[PDB]
Ligand binder design. Structure first.
Ligand SMILES: Nc1ncnc2c1ncn2[C@@H]1O[C@H](COP(=O)(O)O)[C@@H](O)[C@H]1O
Ligand SMILES: Nc1ncnc2c1ncn2[C@@H]1O[C@H](COP(=O)(O)O)[C@@H](O)[C@H]1O
Ligand SMILES: Nc1ncnc2c1ncn2[C@@H]1O[C@H](COP(=O)(O)O)[C@@H](O)[C@H]1O
Ligand SMILES: Nc1ncnc2c1ncn2[C@@H]1O[C@H](COP(=O)(O)O)[C@@H](O)[C@H]1O
Ligand SMILES: [Mg+2]
Ligand SMILES: [Mg+2]
Ligand SMILES: [Mg+2]
Lengths: 310, 310
C-alpha cells in the first residue's frame, strides 16, 4: 500500500514533433517563434498523483491516490479509477469547483511549458497523509503548496518514508520551505532542470542535498538517470525508445517504477532500470497514461534489455 | 482599397507573465520547464488577416479581408466584422467546417509557440486575389500554403503591389517557392527571427533580399524596426509602451500601420513610425484585437512620440 500524493488533473497536450532547442536564436530579440499543425483536440487523464498511480498499477502494485478533484467534471476520472481498480479512499471531490487542468505545450525533449488552472488542487490540504492506513511508502508530488507542505510534515512525523518530487510546484516554495521538505524527505526524485532549480532555491549543492536524504535521483531524458547515495552513485541507462511520440508523463512513469522498486527492496540498479523502462514505454504513446503494457509485457521487455526478470 | 490575405482565427493565448529567455538552462538536458498560473479562458478574435485589417480599419484605411472561416463558428467573427465596419465580400465561409483556432503559448518577448488547428484555413485557395475589384495595395500573410502561393501569383499578374509576410507559414515553403514569392513581392515585412529563417531557406543574404524588393522591413520587438529601401535605411524607434500585457498580434498591428502609410504616400520613416505606434498601442492589451484607440488618440500619441502629424 503506497500513498500517492499529488495533483489529479485534466491534460490538454500539444507536442511539437521536434526539439525547441534547434529553433532558439539568442541573437534575435525574438528567441523562438514556432507554429506547428495539430489535429482535433483530445482531453487526457493526468495530474502527478494520477500518472504515478497508473504506472504503479500497471506494475501490479497497490496505489492509493491522495488528492483533490472538483465535482463538476470529476466523474470521468472517478469512473476510470473504478474501471482500473484504483482506490478512491483519499480522492476528495469538492462540490461546485473545477478539477485542475493543464494546458501543456512541449517538444520531444520534454520541455513542458504549462499554463495551469489549479482549480480543485488549491484545496489539496483537506487530505491528511498522517491519517492514511497501513502505508508502506509514499510520494509527495506537485500539488497545492499547503498540501505539499502538510503532506511532507505528516508523513515524516509518521515515520512513513517518502519520495519528494516537488516538480512543477517549485515556484510555490522558497528557500526555507524547500529546505524543510527536503529535510523531511527520504528520497528526492527530480529531472535535471528541477535539480538546478532546487540547488538554487535551497542554496545547497547537490553534495549537500545528497547528504540529507537516502537517495537523490536526477532524470535526464534520453540520457537516463543518476541515483546518488553519499557513498556511491548508480548511472541508470535509458531503454532505447521504440519511437518518441510524447514525453509528457515520463517523469511520472519513471517514479511508478522507482516506487515499485523501493517497496520490493530492489537493488538501486534494478529499481532505476525498471523506472527507466517505464519511461521508455510511455514515450511511445501520446499523453501521460496512453501506454498500457501488461506486466508480462513489461517483464519481457526488461529481460530483453537487461537479461533478467524484475 | 487594401486586400488583406491571411488567416482568420480564434486565439487562445497563454502569455507567460515573464520571459522564456530567463528560464532557459542550456547546460541541462531539459532546456526549459515552466508551469504558470492562468486565469480561465477567453476565446479572442485573431488570425493574421483578421488582425491586420483590424489595425488598418482603426486608422480609417479601407481593409478588405480575404480569408476563409468555418460555418460552424463563423457567425461571432462575422457579426463583429459588421460592428467594426469591415467588408465581408472576400470572407468566404465554408459550410460544415470549423474556423481555424490557435493555442498560443507566449511571453512578454513575443516568443509565440503555437499549436494551430487550421480547419477552414486549409481551403483558403478558394479565394482568388485576381478577382478582387478596385484594390491598389495588398498583403499576403500566413494562411494555407496553396492559398498563400496562389495570392502571391495572382496579385503579381494583376499588377497589385503587395507586402509578403510569410511569418508562421514559413515551414510550408521550400527554397524555390520562397524565392519565387519574394521575387513576386514588392515589399517584405517580417520579425527578426523570421528574417533569418528566410535567409537560411532562400540562401540569400539580407543584402541580397533587399536588392529584390522595394522595401525590406524587419521588426525587433522593443527595439523597434528597420526599413531597408534601396536609396536608404530607416531605423524606426520603438514607441515606449504604456504597459506590456500581451505582444500577440503586435506584428499584425504594425503591418496595418505600414499599409495605411504606403497607400497615403508617407515616406518610409513616417510610415514605419505609425507602424511602430500601432504595435505599442496593441501591446498595452491582452490579445491581438482588444485595443480600440480612436483616430484622435492615435493622432495625439503619434505627435507626442514623434513631434509631428503624418
Ligand atoms: N503546477 C502544477 N502542479 C501540479 N501538477 C502539474 C502542474 N503542472 C503540470 N502538472 C501535471 O504535471 C503532469 C506532467 O508531469 P510529468 O509526469 O513530470 O511529465 C501532468 O499530468 C499535469 O497534469
Ligand atoms: N527519449 C527518451 N528515450 C528513452 N527514455 C526516456 C526518454 N525520455 C525520457 N525517458 C525515460 O523517462 C525518464 C524521465 O524522463 P524525463 O522526465 O524527461 O527526465 C528518463 O530518465 C528515462 O528513463
Ligand atoms: N500556422 C499559422 N497559420 C496562420 N496563422 C497563424 C498561425 N499561427 C498563428 N497564427 C495567427 O497569427 C496571429 C499572431 O501573429 P502576429 O500578429 O505576427 O503576432 C494570431 O492571430 C494567430 O491566429
Ligand atoms: N515591448 C514593446 N514595447 C513597445 N513596442 C513594441 C513592443 N513589442 C513590440 N512593439 C512594437 O510592435 C512591433 C512589432 O513587434 P514584433 O512583432 O514583436 O516585432 C515592433 O516593431 C514595435 O514597434
Ligand atoms: Mg516531473
Ligand atoms: Mg521582384
Ligand atoms: Mg507576424
Amino acid at each position: 500500500a503506497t500513498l500517492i500524493c499529488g495533483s489529479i488533473a485534466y491534460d490538454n497536450i500539444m507536442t511539437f514533433e521536434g526539439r525547441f532547442r534547434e529553433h532558439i536564436l539568442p541573437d534575435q530579440v525574438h528567441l523562438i517563434n514556432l507554429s506547428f499543425l495539430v489535429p482535433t483536440m483530445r482531453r487526457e487523464f493526468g495530474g502527478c498523483a494520477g500518472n504515478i498511480a497508473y504506472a504503479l498499477n500497471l506494475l501490479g502494485g497497490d496505489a492509493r491516490m491522495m488528492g483533490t478533484l472538483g465535482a463538476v467534471d470529476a466523474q470521468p476520472y472517478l469512473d476510470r479509477m473504478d474501471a482500473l481498480g484504483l482506490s478512491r479512499e483519499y480522492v476528495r471531490v469538492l462540490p461546485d469547483t473545477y478539477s485542475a487542468q493543464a494546458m501543456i505545450t512541449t517538444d520531444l525533449d520534454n520541455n513542458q511549458i504549462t499554463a495551469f488552472h489549479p482549480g480543485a488542487m488549491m484545496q489539496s490540504h483537506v487530505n491528511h497523509a498522517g491519517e492514511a492506513k497501513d502505508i508502506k511508502l509514499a510520494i509527495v508530488g506537485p500539488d497545492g503548496f499547503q498540501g505539499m507542505v502538510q503532506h511532507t510534515e505528516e508523513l515524516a512525523q509518521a515515520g512513513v518514508p517518502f519520495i519528494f518530487d516537488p516538480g512543477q510546484g517549485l515556484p510555490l516554495f522558497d528557500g526555507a520551505t524547500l529546505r524543510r521538505s527536503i529535510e523531511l524527505a527520504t528520497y528526492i526524485a527530480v529531472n535535471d532542470y528541477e535539480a538546478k532549480l532546487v540547488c538554487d532555491k535551497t542554496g545547497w549543492s547537490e553534495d549537500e542535498i545528497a547528504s540529507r536524504v537516502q537517495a537523490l535521483i536526477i532524470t535526464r531524458g534520453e540520457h537516463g538517470a543518476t541515483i546518488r547515495h553519499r557513498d556511491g552513485t548508480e548511472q541508470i541507462p535509458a531503454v532505447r525508445a521504440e519511437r518518441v511520440i510524447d514525453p509528457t508523463g515520463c517523469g511520472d512513469a519513471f517514479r511508478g517504477g522507482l516506487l515499485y522498486g523501493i517497496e520490493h527492496g530492489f537493488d538501486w540498479a534494478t529499481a532505476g532500470r525498471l523506472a527507466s523502462l517505464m519511461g521508455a514505454l510511455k514515450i511511445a504513446h501520446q499523453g501521460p497514461q496512453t501506454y498500457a503494457p501488461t506486466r508480462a509485457e513489461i517483464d519481457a521487455r526488461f529481460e530483453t534489455a537487461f537479461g533478467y526478470r524484475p
